[PDB]
Amino acid sequence: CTCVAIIMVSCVTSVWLLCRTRNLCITPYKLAPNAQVPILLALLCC
Amino acid sequence: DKTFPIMLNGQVNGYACVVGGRVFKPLHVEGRIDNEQLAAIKLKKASIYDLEYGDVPQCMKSDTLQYTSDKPPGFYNWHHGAVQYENNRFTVPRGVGGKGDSGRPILDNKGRVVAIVLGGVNEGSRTALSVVTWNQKGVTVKDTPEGSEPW
Amino acid sequence: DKTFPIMLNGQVNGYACVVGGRVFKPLHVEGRIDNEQLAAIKLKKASIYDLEYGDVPQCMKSDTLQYTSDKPPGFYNWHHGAVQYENNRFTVPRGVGGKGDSGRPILDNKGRVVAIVLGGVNEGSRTALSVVTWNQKGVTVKDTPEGSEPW
Numbered sequence: 069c070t071c072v073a074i075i076m077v078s079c080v081t082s083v084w085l086l087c088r089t090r091n092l093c094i095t096p097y098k099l100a101p102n103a104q105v106p107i108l109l110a111l112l113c114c
Numbered sequence: 115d116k117t118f119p120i121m122l123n124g125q126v127n128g129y130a131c132v133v134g135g136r137v138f139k140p141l142h143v144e145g146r147i148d149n150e151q152l153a154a155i156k157l158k159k160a161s162i163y164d165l166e167y168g169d170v171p172q173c174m175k176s177d178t179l180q181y182t183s184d185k186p187p188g189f190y191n192w193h194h195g196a197v198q199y200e201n202n203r204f205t206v207p208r209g210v211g212g213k214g215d216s217g218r219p220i221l222d223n224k225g226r227v228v229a230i231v232l233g234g235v236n237e238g239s240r241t242a243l244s245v246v247t248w249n250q251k252g253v254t255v256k257d258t259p260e261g262s263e264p265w
Numbered sequence: 266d267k268t269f270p271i272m273l274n275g276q277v278n279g280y281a282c283v284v285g286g287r288v289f290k291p292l293h294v295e296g297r298i299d300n301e302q303l304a305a306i307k308l309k310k311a312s313i314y315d316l317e318y319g320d321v322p323q324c325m326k327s328d329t330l331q332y333t334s335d336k337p338p339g340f341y342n343w344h345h346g347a348v349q350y351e352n353n354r355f356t357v358p359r360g361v362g363g364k365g366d367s368g369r370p371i372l373d374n375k376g377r378v379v380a381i382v383l384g385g386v387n388e389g390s391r392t393a394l395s396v397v398t399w400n401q402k403g404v405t406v407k408d409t410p411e412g413s414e415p416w
Contacts, residue, residue: 236326237322237323237324237326238323238324238325238326238327239326239327240326240327261323
């Protein structure tokens with residue numbers, strides 16, 4: 069019981085930190101709102 | 115694109131507009147929108163700038179120019195008028211109140227709009243200032259005159 | 266930027282100034298400052314030059330130009346006036362007392378300031394001299410006319 073509890077809490081903490089980091093990685097491209105030349109990344113506007 | 119004021123308790127906090135779609139929505143300070151009819155919509159944010167993204171309506175097509183970063187020291191107009199300096203920001207004179215004056219764009223004499231204010235009023239008799247513009251590579255240059263007077 | 270003299274026991278030892286911030290603070294010889302009000306502050310040193318760094322106040326903004334190293338043989342003014350030579354230093358004539366004359370900048374006719382004296386008065390009837398300026402790469406060219414008359 070204690071081990072399943074602690075492993076689940078560790079994993080979910082990792083998950084939230086993941087989402088944090090991911091939106092932080094999102095934050096850069098807000099340059100593009102200028103609507104100008106592309107810089108060849110994973111997301112697309114061809 | 116009219117300089118739609120932001121009525122901060124009756125102010126004009128941001129006399130903002132849309133330079134071809136994306137509106138100069140400043141999350142900088144405040145203000146009840148002028149074109150709240152148009153501005154009934156919500157917007158993005160800008161952490162590096164305390165701003166927001168307009169992406170104006172299709173009905174709102176033909177909004178304003180978005181002149182490129184190509185600029186020498188040239189008199190770009192504003193509410194306070196025009197001023198011509200490039201290395202240091204535009205050669206306005208000390209004596210204009212940047213606080214509240216946020217929302218003045220780089221109204222370059224060629225009908226060119228490439229920048230808008232950010233702060234940093236003056237120490238000498240001239241007034242170069244902090245702005246937001248396109249960078250050397252055209253990147254979203256967020257100009258920060260070191261030791262910036264708020265707006 | 267006025268040629269603020271350095272009153273060496275009543276002298277004008279360095280008629281110095283600030284070319285856009287950094288002041289021509291010569292640790293070369295001596296002198297009670299003219300703008301001691303402004304010059305109440307302390308400064309850096311310059312081992313290769315016997316000088317000091319001003320980095321003038323924000324209140325002291327808009328000090329003077331800092332013209333680039335681009336210079337042909339051209340008449341750059343001084344207390345003694347202007348003189349035009351490039352390979353050899355400016356074509357002043359022998360007959361000006363460099364000692365004490367330290368602190369004269371390269372007042373190029375285009376409103377250009379790119380250099381200031383270091384010594385090396387004359388042997389022939391002309392007077393090329395030692396200076397301090399920007400180098401070919403714009404480096405802080407400390408010009409040393411070989412066999413330099415002090416200042």
